[PDB]
């Protein structure tokens, strides 16, 4: 109703101003997106090449790419046609248009996750709390047919069913696929997805502060120096007698 539950603040390893993203966990999150979320969520602004050098090796990325049939053309006869994926392609849209997506989700439209953490107050803290925060409605609350209860979602009746549960997949790195473990990895992924610069952005900040300190200092000395002439300046009124 007019009441909402704001999420808590988890200590993400990248929360700190000098704290990079845990690429291992980002690699993981990818899998979660690929093998679970992608079925209904589009990530239009990311491409397989973006993974290269971040979470995957070039080969791995090329591989992941080819696993998808892409529509190209027209050809010589002006025909469209399928073809393997290229590292240049973007992550596959599960539906050709919102109307279709909605059609396949009770009229509910799964948003594109490319910029999700920044499109919602709370970011990963919110996305995480939502993914795990599913539960039964409190007394007096009837969740319309089709919608599921989730106290963290505004209105508490969301259209998405709990996407994850223990062992819904198997991290090829050997990480215990517990539900929250998953949420933690995909959220970490959704952060990188919304801002790959994230790491460099912060490395720069570091250099920035250092220089800014060194330089603001040297310039404070310089400003003072020149001004001393005036600061210590002494004067007197010696009228004629």
């Amino acid at each position: 109703g007019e009441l909402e539950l704001h999420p808590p603040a988890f200590p993400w390893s990248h929360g700190g101003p000098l704290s990079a993203l845990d690429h291992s966990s980002v690699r993981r999150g990818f899998q979660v997106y690929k093998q679970v979320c992608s079925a209904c969520h589009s990530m239009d602004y990311v491409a397989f090449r973006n993974l290269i050098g971040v979470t995957h090796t070039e080969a791995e990325a090329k591989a992941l790419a080819e696993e998808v049939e892409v529509q190209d053309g027209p050809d010589e006869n002006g025909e469209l046609f399928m073809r393997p994926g290229k590292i240049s392609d973007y992550f596959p849209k599960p539906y050709p248009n919102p109307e279709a997506a909605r059609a396949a989700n009770n009229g509910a439209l799964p948003p594109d996750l490319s910029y999700i953490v920044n499109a919602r107050h709370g970011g990963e803290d919110y996305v995480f709390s939502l993914l795990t925060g599913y539960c039964d409605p409190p007394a007096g609350v009837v969740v319309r047919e089709g919608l599921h209860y989730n106290p963290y979602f505004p209105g508490q009746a969301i259209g998405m069913a709990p996407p994850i549960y223990n062992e819904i997949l198997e991290y090829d790195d050997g990480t215990p696929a517990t539900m929250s473990q998953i949420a933690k990895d995909v959220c970490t992924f959704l952060r990188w997805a919304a801002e790959p610069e994230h790491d460099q952005r912060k490395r720069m900040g570091l250099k920035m502060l250092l220089i800014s300190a060194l330089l603001t200092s040297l310039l404070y000395y310089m400003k003072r120096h020149k001004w001393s002439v005036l600061k210590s300046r002494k004067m007197a009124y010696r009228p004629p007698k």
């Binding site: 004067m235 009124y237 009228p239």
Partner: protein, 101 residues
Amino acid sequence: GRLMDRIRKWYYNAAGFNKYGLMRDDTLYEDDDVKEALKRLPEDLYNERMFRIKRALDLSLKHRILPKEQWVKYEEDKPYLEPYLKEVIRERLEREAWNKK
């Protein structure tokens, strides 16, 4: 009565322009009337006002004030311009009334 008379002394210390060594008249904003007045000031008075001001500006750039011992005392404030200024404004008003006449 002697109410605002002490009120005044309070305000005078509250304003604080004396911590700079200025008289009430020194701080006057120089509009037309004041500029005309300043012109009539005998030289000593004018040269003195200048120094007071120049010293205050130096104090300001320095971010300092005079030692408490040199601050002007409410009752020792000389309204060296006040009178001249009166006349100037008096003079002007006449011309004005006369020209509308």
